[PDB]
Amino acid sequence: SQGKEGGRDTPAVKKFLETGENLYIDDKSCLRNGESLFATSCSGCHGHLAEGKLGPGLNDNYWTYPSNTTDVGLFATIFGGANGMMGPHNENLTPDEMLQTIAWIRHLYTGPKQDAVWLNDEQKKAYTPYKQGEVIPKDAKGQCKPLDE
Numbered sequence: 842s843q844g845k846e847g848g849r850d851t852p853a854v855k856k857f858l859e860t861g862e863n864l865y866i867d868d869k870s871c872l873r874n875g876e877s878l879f880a881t882s883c884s885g886c887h888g889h890l891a892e893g894k895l896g897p898g899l900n901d902n903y904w905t906y907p908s909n910t911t912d913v914g915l916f917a918t919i920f921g922g923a924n925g926m927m928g929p930h931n932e933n934l935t936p937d938e939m940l941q942t943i944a945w946i947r948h949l950y951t952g953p954k955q956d957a958v959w960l961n962d963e964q965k966k967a968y969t970p971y972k973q974g975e976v977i978p979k980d981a982k983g984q985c986k987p988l989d990e
């Protein structure tokens with residue numbers, strides 16, 4: 842909406858614009874939000890688990906546009922999708938919400954650990970193919986304020 846919030850000046854967005862790093866990767870509070878944001882903005886075409894439906898599966902190691910293997914690339918795709926050639930994507934999420942959504946898409950990954958270029962050395966160590974039924978603890982607290990609270 843608007844009012845008094847953040848969106849484009851949060852520490853995560855600042856860090857992202859400085860190094861391309863997504864501080865929300867593996868942050869449970871951000872993942873909980875991202876799961877919800879992904880649901881209403883992307884799942885309708887990419888599937889509930891990003892397995893693919895009308896749009897391609899975003900949970901595997903094949904990418905039509907490899908730039909999407911980095912969070913900056915994925916971000917640019919949606920924010921600059923405005924009638925282009927990489928899909929029917931419109932900038933509807935704030936920059937901060939986008940990072941949370943991207944963090945969730947990465948969490949939905951089910952492919953080879955070595956192809957997860959969006960994860961650093963440590964995060965790759967903690968990577969595990971997403972399995973349906975998983976439940977992010979609802980009392981999880983982190984860098985992201987719960988969308989419901």
Ligand code: HEM
Binds near residue numbers: 886887896909928
């Ligand atoms: C913020 C929500 C969304 C995100 C993050 C998202 C992300 C992406 C990404 C990263 C790709 C490229 C995949 C690749 O390179 O292999 C893609 C492709 C595509 N998306 Fe989405 N998507 C979203 C919403 C939607 C919606 C709502 C629709 C339908 C109105 C849609 C339809 C498509 C289609 C048809 C393609 C394939 C386009 C092509 O191959 O050129 N997407 N999406």
Ligand SMILES: [Ca+2]
Binds near residue numbers: 901902905
């Ligand atoms: Ca894919």
